[PDB]
Amino acid sequence: MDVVIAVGAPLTGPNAAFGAQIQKGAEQAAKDINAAGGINGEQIKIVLGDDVSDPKQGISVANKFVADGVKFVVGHFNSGVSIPASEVYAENGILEITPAATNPVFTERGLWNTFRTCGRDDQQGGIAGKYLADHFKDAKVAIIHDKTPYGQGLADETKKAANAAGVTEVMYEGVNVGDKDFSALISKMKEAGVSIIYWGGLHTEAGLIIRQAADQGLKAKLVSGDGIVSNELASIAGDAVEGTLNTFGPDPTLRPENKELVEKFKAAGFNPEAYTLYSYAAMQAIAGAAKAAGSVEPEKVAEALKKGSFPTALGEISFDEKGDPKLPGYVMYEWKKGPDGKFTYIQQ
């Protein structure tokens, strides 16, 4: 009997590019695992659900997944979607491994079923806060967030670390996802002499802020996190994106063992950036743990994940008792023109 595995992701809406990363990564992993004989002899069947980065629609997706006999979910992208969806999964025998949801709460509720292949924002905020102090000790910093669990959570963790290392921000403000006119906020930052904008949120608003700041004459560098890692940031921001900084794990597309896999994606017409290989790795973790458990029962795979080590596109993976992965930590990237002439994030 096929093992039914769902991709729950923002396949449409503002984060569609991230949805594609997650979908393409999981689909390719399923194809590769199937060609190798499947999971414990059984083929993987992929089902898709589009959450539109909307917690309400994410809950409808989770219901559809339960009805369809889903056993494992790779997803979701947004913490605000993943946290509520994970309770549906937890109460209905489904293991959820997110490749991108970073808010600490996701693995801090004592749920048997929650795992990640990505980091978490107390870690990320610690790294970013220290960076702010190490490199911009005397800067006037504005901390701005998007009022979501991810965005404000990250901004708050960073504020805490930055404050402890001696940086006191001159502004702390929230904006709404979907707001597009940042003239007033930018003017306020200019008045306050801001030279660094720390952004807790995703690429859409970051891109709008970067573009508008340059147009309005605010000389400030934007520093953000693992929510801005998409070419779409550059498409919105334009050349003003240059010099933007952000935290993210080591770029898995640069790992030598992934050379052939990255070439395969491109031969299929997809640039497998950012979370693509985190999603691929989530699939591999499920397959590895089922192999170790001698079972595809989600509760048994969960136990196996917490015990063993498994080969993935991110490197050898293992998990703590909360379901967080033991992998390389966050590093700082800068936006510059890559070898292909496009602006992208390059590790400093």
Ligand code: PRO
């Ligand atoms: O948890 C979240 O919502 C964001 C999405 C990309 C990185 N973490």
